[PDB]
Design a protein around this ligand. Structure first.
Ligand SMILES: *Cc1cc2c(cc1C)nc1c(=O)[nH]c(=O)nc-1n2C[C@H](O)[C@H](O)[C@H](O)COP(=O)(O)OP(=O)(O)OC[C@H]1O[C@@H](n2cnc3c(N)ncnc32)[C@H](O)[C@@H]1O
Ligand SMILES: C/C=C/CC/C=C/CC/C=C/CCCCCCC(=O)OC[C@H](COP(=O)(O)OCCN)OC(=O)CCCCCCC/C=C/C/C=C/CCC
Ligand code: HEM
Ligand SMILES: CNC(=O)c1ccccc1I
Ligand code: SF4
Ligand code: F3S
Ligand code: FES
Lengths: 138, 102, 613, 239
């Protein structure tokens, strides 16, 4: 009875049985480390979604870039309302950038302890907020 | 008996530290040369990123190949689309520069 | 009965049990090319040997000059001359080989400056035949020696084609005409019944610590193999000999390792005295387990208890350097904090003598073969073997030495396997079993499954656990033992008045623990009756009516100018115990302790002498 | 008098159509030991004997408890009851597993994954074994600290979202740590091919360093640290 045979028999038994699956995310406790990995996906997903939209529209939509910017100027420009879309663009990018460094630092083997996760994680958040409020102001 | 999985991983981290190289390197000194390498790194790092999400969530071999191919197309159009924007329009750097001047 | 599906299996050998013993016997048989099944009610890694802490004795001599013959002396000296010296020769002779085998298997033993296996000082062990001073032969993986032992053993068990029945509860032996043909077992998962027939059967189920209210042993230590042999009508040996470990935590009664005492740990009373110096001057708190706890238990009735109830004693590590606790004793350092809330580095542990190990069990050859008692003489039961705590080759006799059961396990598990390999060949006629056979064991299962009595399984368990705890403790008297006897008999009467609740087949633990109660009761009866019958004080068994060591001679003076006693006038002999299952009556006989070794020229017989530390 | 309420997951397989639900049990904490198991055993013995769970050691070295207490995975026998009476204790079977009955899951797949990494010492020359003790320096042996202590309780793999989604092909932290344990064991000769065994997308590379595992461990061990370290070797080993 090899390890590969044991597994084929596990899946054969359980799927063919009226056994329920034990609840996971519905019951498992929220921790900062987890919530920050979830957000890293979303930012990553959202960010590619934008890079794809920007590149895809460069091929599909008529007119140049300025042409599209003059259409932005035309939609009754809000004063602080323009600083919002500018922040909404830059907030996920900064978060994903900082936490990305954090991921690279883990990939090196450093800072992988429960205390060090809470600190480095909290540092990322502060770094996101500050460089997000900072960039939108440029 | 290749090392294709670990080479992928090291490649991912490479372009990751390379894209982190280019973001500051683009603000300081924006040029034609920087726009294409940003399009390269951007779509590549992006492509391999979605690759992981696909392999994680897309269950079954039937859908696995389709998602991959479907993503390959979406990436190849994204890269070429940015390179078009780079040659035939203002370019990524200056496009952002204009967007932030607004 | 037509409600239960019976699945029949065919093998060369069955090993019931997956402790250290079980595993080593189970893959021993497969290494030697037998189609082998290992039955176990728990997943191998969950077995008890996991809880093992201190070490495994082998005369490797990595710390000083050593000799396995010195190990021998200490072990027979420890056994208070009830240990069968032929099994004690075999085990110590084999130790340095058996331990190296484990290290080559991949056991992460702690290391010395040279890079050899680290050995530790442990209770009751000496150089130069008891006159050369404290010996250091307790091989150890820090504070977790048994855990590492079990996992590497299990690690290895995977290399071979042994067919395991994980979480299967063995019910009874498959007996036909005084010969053993396998086991009938319950499949805990789907609730089905399995007869697994084979030419040989190894029982390695471990002891029955759970007969008491306070024990370092696990919940699943219920003497299940011991009960099967009892139900078979075969005898059990020396069951009254129950070892109390000196150092179990006041709280959940968990084991703090004797390794603490060897590493320099000291036992202290309420008045600050290192009380062991008053008792055993030479060996101090590193004396024999029977002797150490005896002194502890005595300090308490004298008013020198340490708690608010004045009922425990302190084990102190405070003085030892923190790095020593870190490298040597990290395992207890955590469990001391978890249960007693103690920082060993700052405060001493509240410890207490608590039930630990069962030297008695199933009569065994030095080879491993199960014995019955016929015409006052030893006779081999065909197809039956037993090794480890469940057994009794009586390598430990009246008192076990520290780090010796783990050896016992790995040494005899192995022996069982060679002894089968040498006697027969695989592919030999597997003896066929009756169509009906096992009928009675299912009849029993079914009865308990739908039990509609008045006494809950746990209410009758606690009644037994408390009654053994107060009538068969460290010290016992005729009166108190007698009162215990007719109390455990009343409780066996109540075995047919019990209540069960779960009517399901799947994982019916209600039923499984009720089967365990039947087993535990049979174990308790024999333990307490044999204890009442033994009118002497030898090793663990301490009578306050008969505190004298009663041997064939008065060995406390010049031998052989003296009148030898008739067999049934001394107690230097093994208690064989039977029980009629229908009425729970304990009838009991005796057989002699084996004094001769395997080779006098290599290992001299150690005669009885004054035993003190 | 101090009454603590417990919300426990229940499922009888032999009951027709009875699906999973929560049952509440009320315990007096004055007649009950400090740990969560002590409670489960107590209700088993006094309130309901249908409550089904694994337990052996009650010392925290066998790995039998292995349940989801109040949000996370631990060992019941080693976790103390929250003395806050206003709170209700939520007890679940280990996350994302097929439930056999109540708090007992099917760990057989997990076990098989452990079986596939070859958790034993391997030597190139097997002929000289059983007669000499192998040499390992005290420095070499310390590399195994924090690694060998594992108890295979499956808390960590059962907390890992990668193991939730891809538990079929992803080996999980519990098992991956042990591969590392054998990798840096000086006495092992098969380091290179132990790493070659992980050369695919799923076995090791489903770890995205979520670090739930280390956060849940009952023993204080650090699975993720080893995964991280495994990946490092995978990138840097030769031929
Ligand atoms: C309690 C204890 C004992 C101990 C120790 C620490 C603790 C906490 N430390 C020791 C040490 O450091 N050195 C040493 O020499 N001894 C130590 N001890 C004692 C020692 O651990 C035991 O003597 C020994 O380990 C017992 O193991 P054994 O292999 O003999 O049996 P087991 O480990 O308890 O496992 C029994 C197996 O049998 C199966 N079983 C039982 N009944 C059935 C039925 N009904 N059907 C099917 N299978 C059954 C169990 O599943 C188990 O696998
Ligand atoms: C984080 C790493 C840490 C490094 C810290 C150094 C700070 C550099 C900031 C980098 C972040 C880029 C955004 C800056 C910005 O808003 O553009 C203003 C600039 C004003 O014009 P200027 O440079 O003063 O004018 C030209 C004269 N030099 O415009 C630019 O020229 C910069 C353009 C380069 C940015 C390209 C990134 C695009 C990728 C985002 C994709 C996500 C889509 C959603
Ligand atoms: C230079 C700044 C960036 C750095 C340092 C960085 C780094 C990383 C790293 C290390 C990962 C892997 C995380 C893991 O181990 O699971 C990752 C994931 C990902 N990244 Fe980036 N990234 C950056 C910017 C971007 C941008 C601009 C995009 C948009 C195209 C992007 C898209 C993604 C996607 C889609 C993922 C997959 C999400 C996941 O698997 O969890 N990243 N990033
Ligand atoms: C909810 N947890 C996930 O599925 C997840 C989140 C972030 C990164 C990787 C993963 I596998
Ligand atoms: S690393 Fe910890 S959580 Fe994981 S199996 Fe081992 S003991 Fe359990
Ligand atoms: S949580 Fe899972 S994905 Fe990771 S680092 Fe631990 S194995
Ligand atoms: S019961 Fe042994 S670990 Fe919890």
């Amino acid at each position: 009875t090899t390890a590969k045979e044991e597994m084929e028999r596990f899946w054969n038994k359980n799927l063919g049985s009226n056994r329920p699956l034990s609840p996971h995310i519905t019951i498992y406790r929220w921790s900062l480390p987890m919530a920050m990995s979830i957000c890293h996906r979303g930012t990553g997903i959202a960010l590619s979604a934008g890079v794809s939209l920007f590149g895809l529209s460069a091929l599909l939509l008529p007119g140049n870039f300025e042409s599209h910017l003059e259409l932005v100027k035309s939609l009754c420009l809000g004063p602080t309302l323009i600083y919002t879309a500018k922040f909404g663009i830059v907030f996920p990018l900064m978060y994903h950038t900082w936490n990305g460094i954090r991921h690279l630092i883990w990939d090196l083997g450093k800072g992988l302890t429960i205390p060090q996760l809470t600190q480095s994680g909290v540092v990322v958040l502060i770094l996101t907020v500050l460089s997000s409020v900072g960039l939108a102001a440029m | 008996s290749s090392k294709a999985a670990s080479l992928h991983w090291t490649g991912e981290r490479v372009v990751s530290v390379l894209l982190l190289g280019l973001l500051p390197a683009a603000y300081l000194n924006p040029c034609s040369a920087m726009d294409y390498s940003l399009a390269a790194a951007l779509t590549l790092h992006g492509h391999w990123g979605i690759g992981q999400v696909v392999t994680d969530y897309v269950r079954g071999d039937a859908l696995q190949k389709a998602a991959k191919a479907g993503l390959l197309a979406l990436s190849a159009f994204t890269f070429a689309g940015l390179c078009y924007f780079n040659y035939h329009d203002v370019g990524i750097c200056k496009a952002v520069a204009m967007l932030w001047k607004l | 009965s037509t409600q239960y599906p019976v699945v029949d299996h065919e093998f060369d050998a069955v090993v019931v049990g997956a402790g250290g013993a079980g595993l080593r016997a189970a893959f021993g048989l497969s290494e030697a090319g037998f189609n082998t099944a290992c039955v176990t009610k728990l997943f191998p890694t969950r077995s008890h040997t996991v809880a093992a802490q201190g070490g495994i004795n082998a005369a490797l001599g990595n710390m000083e000059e050593d000799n396995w013959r010195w190990h021998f002396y200490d072990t027979v000296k420890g056994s208070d001359w009830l240990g069968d010296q032929d099994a004690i020769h075999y085990m110590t002779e084999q130790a340095p080989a058996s331990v190296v085998e484990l290290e080559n298997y991949g056991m992460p033993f702690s290391r010395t400056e040279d890079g050899k296996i680290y050995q530790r000082a442990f209770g009751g062990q000496s150089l130069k035949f008891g006159k050369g001073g404290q010996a250091h032969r307790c091989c150890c993986v820090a504070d977790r020696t048994g855990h590492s032992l079990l996992h590497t053993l299990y690690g290895r068990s995977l290399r071979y084609d042994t067919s395991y029945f994980v979480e299967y509860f063995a019910l009874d032996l498959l007996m036909e005409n005084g010969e053993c043909r396998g086991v009938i077992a319950l499949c805990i998962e789907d609730g089905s019944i399995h007869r697994i027939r084979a030419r040989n059967t190894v029982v390695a189920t471990g002891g029955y610590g759970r007969t008491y209210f306070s024990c370092t042993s696990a919940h699943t230590s219920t003497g299940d193999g011991t009960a099967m042999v009892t139900r078979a009508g075969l005898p059990c040996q020396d069951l009254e000999f129950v070892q109390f470990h000196p150092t179990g935590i006041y709280g959940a009664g968990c084991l703090i390792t004797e390794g603490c005492r060897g590493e320099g740990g000291i036992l202290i009373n309420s008045q600050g005295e290192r009380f062991m110096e008053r008792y055993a001057p030479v060996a101090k708190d590193l004396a024999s387990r029977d002797v150490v706890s005896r002194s502890m238990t005595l300090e308490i009735r004298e008013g020198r208890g340490c708690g608010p109830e004045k009922d425990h004693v302190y084990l102190q590590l405070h003085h030892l350097p923190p790095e020593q606790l870190a490298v040597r004793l990290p395992g207890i350092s955590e469990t001391a904090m978890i249960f007693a809330g103690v920082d060993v580095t700052k405060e001493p542990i509240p410890v207490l003598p608590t039930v630990h190990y069962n030297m008695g069990g199933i009569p065994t050859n030095y080879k491993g073969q199960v014995l019955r008692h016929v015409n006052g003489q030893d006779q081999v039961v065909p197809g039956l073997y037993a090794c480890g705590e469940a057994a009794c080759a009586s390598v430990h006799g009246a008192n076990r030495l520290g780090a010796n059961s783990l050896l016992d396990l790995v040494v005899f598990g192995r022996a069982c396997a060679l002894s089968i390999a040498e006697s027969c060949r695989p592919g030999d006629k597997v003896p066929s079993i009756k169509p009906n056979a096992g009928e009675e064991s299912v009849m029993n299962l079914d009865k308990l499954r739908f039990a509609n009595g008045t006494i809950r399984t746990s209410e009758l368990r606690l009644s037994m656990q408390k009654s053994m705890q107060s009538h068969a403790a460290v010290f016992r008297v005729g009166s108190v033992l007698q009162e215990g006897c007719e109390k455990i008999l009343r409780l066996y009467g109540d075995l047919q008045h019990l209540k069960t609740f779960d009517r399901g087949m799947v994982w019916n633990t209600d039923l499984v623990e009720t089967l365990e109660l039947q087993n535990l009761m049979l174990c308790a009866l024999q333990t307490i009756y044999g204890a009442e019958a033994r009118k002497e004080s030898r090793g663990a068994h301490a009578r306050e009516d008969f505190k004298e060591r009663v041997d064939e001679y008065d060995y406390s003076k010049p031998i052989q100018g003296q009148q030898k006693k008739p067999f049934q006038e001394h107690w230097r002999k093994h208690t064989l115990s039977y029980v009629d299952v229908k009425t729970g009556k304990v009838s009991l006989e005796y057989r002699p302790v084996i004094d001769k070794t395997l080779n006098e020229a290599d290992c001299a017989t150690v005669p009885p002498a004054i035993r003190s530390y | 008098p101090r009454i603590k309420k417990f919300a426990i997951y229940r499922w009888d397989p032999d009951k027709t159509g009875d699906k999973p639900h929560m049952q509440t049990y009320e315990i007096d904490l004055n007649n009950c030991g400090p740990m969560v198991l002590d409670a489960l055993i107590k209700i088993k013995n006094e309130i309901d004997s249908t409550l089904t769970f694994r337990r052996s050691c009650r010392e925290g070295i066998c790995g039998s408890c292995a349940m989801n207490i109040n949000g996370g995975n631990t060992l019941a026998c080693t976790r103390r009851i929250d003395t806050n009476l206003d709170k209700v204790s939520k007890i679940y079977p280990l996350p994302h597993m097929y439930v056999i009955k109540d708090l007992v899951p099917d760990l057989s797949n997990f076990y098989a994954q452990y079986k596939s990494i070859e958790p034993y010492l391997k030597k190139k020359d097997e002929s000289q074994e059983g007669k000499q003790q192998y040499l390992q320096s005290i420095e070499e042996r310390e590399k195994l600290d924090g690694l060998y202590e594992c108890i295979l309780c499956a808390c960590c793999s059962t907390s890992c979202p990668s193991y939730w989604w891809n538990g079929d092909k992803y080996l999980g932290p519990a098992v991956l740590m042990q591969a590392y344990r054998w990798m840096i064991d000086s006495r092992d000769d098969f380091t290179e091919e132990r790493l070659a065994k992980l050369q695919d997308p799923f076995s090791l590379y489903r770890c995205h360093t979520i670090m739930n595992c280390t956060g849940t461990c009952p023993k204080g061990l650090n699975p993720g640290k080893a995964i991280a370290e495994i990946k490092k070797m995978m990138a840097t080993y030769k031929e």
